[PDB]
Design a protein. Structure first.
Lengths: 91, 91, 91, 91, 91, 91, 91, 91, 91, 91, 91, 91, 91, 91
């Protein structure tokens, strides 16, 4: 199976518990491409890093799952984890 | 078959576990129209969102099942989920 | 016999204990083509993955049984298992 | 989904922990329009910026949620964050 | 069903998590009218506001459930929530 | 809600760190009307201006909470703050 | 039930945070009457006023629970709260 | 049938979930009279208050079942529940 | 039978409740040799250590089941358990 | 008749449900003497303590049934149940 | 049954929340006699005092279970609890 | 990993607490390159040297993180610390 | 329990905030008898008088705990407090 | 088991609350040998001394776990703790 489920894990494990809550809150309002659904609010507010990675790779695909994570990380300020994620997924 | 069982599901899945319990508690004393029964305490205080949706569409109908849910949601303060539920069910 | 009963099993076996309930609930309201019946609520809410796959291939046929499963999976958000099922069934 | 949940977050994160308490205290007595509820004291006096933004966007809507926040910010003296919020939300 | 289970909820939700402990502790020693039982210590010291309201309306009735709660609230100093509860319940 | 929770805040925020201590100390011996309780020493000697305003408005009512604060302010010499508080609360 | 669980609470709530620690420390070496147990050090050094009152009335009885608290308060210097407790409990 | 199965329940319901574990642990090593067996560890460490009461009145008799419970409660420090149980059972 | 089912248990029983979840998540994406199947998500995300060991020795054999476990453990950083497993299995 | 089916029961009833699973799993690979068979997996992973005791005394004999149980109990760390089993069986 | 399970509990209940963690960590490397097993890390780092006492008396015997506890307690500095444990266990 | 996280630490540890506050105040208005975010006021005005270094290296990269710090240090007068930082980071 | 935990408290409560630091610093290098441990710097350099007394009586015994404190007090110059401690502890 | 887990503990308990944070920050940038992983920031910036010792001995081995700690301690200035650690570990 694709390695995109491991690049996201190494990015969501390098950020503290106060930035994970902000990530999960930003994930409720980020614009989405057509044909994709949105994770319900009842789950996004309890999931930890592992469940969040699994849900991200399940609802979206590998490529879009990586791109959306990188865009959200860039938007909230952190550009080191976003850069690492882009470097890992792109090649 | 009627799609009002899917609008209620999207309304009970966007609220946390401390708001679902309040919803189930206020469902015990909400005024009811004539000819409709009340869900007993034994089962109502254990069902999750899916079981709650099924049971709500079981005792009540599509139209009244949506209206009662919207009224209860507006009663407890949440006017976003109630608004989207009304928008979906009305048309 | 047809191999479409095996593609459905490989898709419903990757669903957790909470997503299978949502699948079985969405199966009660999904629009149906003319000439096909609906699974009764008495048995639908008790089956496991194997019984669900067998019953789905029983009421519907291979092609429609795969298409309905893929549509229900896409509707509830999961677009990875839906894509896998489509790839397996189409060719 | 609307972006007014993001403009409020950028306004409640630029004020210290001594002004957040004042904001949450003035939120308990601010005048409200008809049809809207008031956040209970039990939860309002324990939330941080993220939960406060989520609850403010949930109880009210995007437009009124932004207007009330701007009015409360202007009431307590801070005219820079209120102006930034108005500029972000209006256009 | 009577609306006395809603007036009590609005009174136990406007007091913090340190006053709820005091409420539950004082509930173990207040005088009781004849014919009524006392909540056991094992369950009382673990309930939050919702279960507390449910059990208070369960063991006692609506009228006595409101009067006892108002008396306990007045005993521990809080004369705002007690006054609001009295105003809601009496008329 | 009542606007008397804001007039008290504007009066306790104009007190230096040495005058707030004297206010909190003289609040321990001021005569009280019948039916009202006294704030315990455990919490009274730790609260800041915001918590003090909240507790003053909770233990007493709006009218008595304002009158007692004005009387205490006048008693220790400061008549500018007491005069402003009286002018704000009365009309 | 006995009122002695309310007289102790009004005595442990009138002492600051550095006197509760001293109270809990002197509670570890005060002489005890025969037949009564000693609170373990593991839980005694974490209890706040409410849990301390509950445990004090649980391990000992009303009369001995009041007398021991009065003796400990007198031994550590505070003669006002000890006098208040004695007056409340005796009559 | 004897009322000794009701006095034990009223004593095992006034103790919290952290004291029930200690009760069940001390029940594994308390000295026993001749002719009586010991509850196996496999079922003892999973029973709740109701099952524990039933097992205690089943393996032992009413008189010895009350005496053993009182002695175990007195051994572990709690002399209020033990005294209440003794008063209830003796006369 | 083979003793490699006991060396794996001694390695999966020394992982905390948070590292077993990571092990089960990384087991969903680890590269696999030809001719071997993959455990479905529906069952793998609920297994504890004992069922995980049994399933690992069921789908894979003794040698490959040990090598895959050692590789997964080493990949997530844990190089003490991997060393113990290698020492136990190789000789 | 032989009493070794009762000594085994007293050893399998003194261990919790989490250790019985480990016992049943370690029974799948323990070395066996020549001439004795192995319990199949289909039945072994469903039996409770009573069925396990009966089946263990069925395949093996009294002496070997006790010795194998003692060895397996020693392997998993429990040397108290193994000791009491040896004491009961040997004399 | 032996009373050495009661002397250990009175020693592990006198440790604060930070000394029990150190006890559990140092229990992972203490030298052991021949023939005795070591508690797995997965369960040892989550046990509280009661389960710790039960496991300590289960894996080892009464005498060794007390001696190991005394050795570990003295090794970390605390020679009061270890002293009373030795005094209780020896005679 | 890059060593620029250690060169910044030696620059923010040689300056007193009256200069760290000025550094943090100047960091709120310094011009920034395109695509980079600005640290919010709520967190920036509470960080010590270590948290400030971590946030500086996280929001920006190694090179820009060092260059911005050197520019800010040069702006506020200190040319020894900035020179040391430039010498360390450049080569 | 022994009264030597109270004689130490009456000696460490008469030290100003500048002499307690000197006492704690000299406690780090004082010669120790064989068989006794030394308090680590991580915890010792933050304790107040109450925690210091508790740790002093816990690590050492009553007699040695008093003697070491008296010697340290005499070594730093204070011979009135050391004399009082010796008089209290000796008889 | 090896005693190198206890030598690290004696070195991390001699660091104040401000030096442990610096140690944990230097642990994020220290060069690593080939074949060893790096602890994620999510858990590194929350751990206390005990969890840090356990995790350090978990990712690395006894020898490398000691050498890395000694080098990091020497880098940050403290050569007494590093000397003690080397003396303990080497022989």
């Amino acid at each position: 199976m694709g390695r995109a489920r491991d690049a996201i894990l190494d990015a969501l494990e390098n950020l503290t518990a106060e930035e994970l809550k902000k990530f999960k809150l930003k994930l409720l309002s980020v614009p989405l491409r057509e044909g994709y659904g949105r994770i319900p609010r009842g789950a996004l507010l309890s999931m930890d890093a592992l469940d969040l990675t699994d849900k991200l790779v399940s609802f979206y695909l590998e490529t879009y799952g990586a791109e959306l994570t990188a865009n959200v990380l860039r938007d909230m300020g952190l550009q080191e984890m976003a850069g690492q994620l882009q470097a890992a997924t792109h090649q």
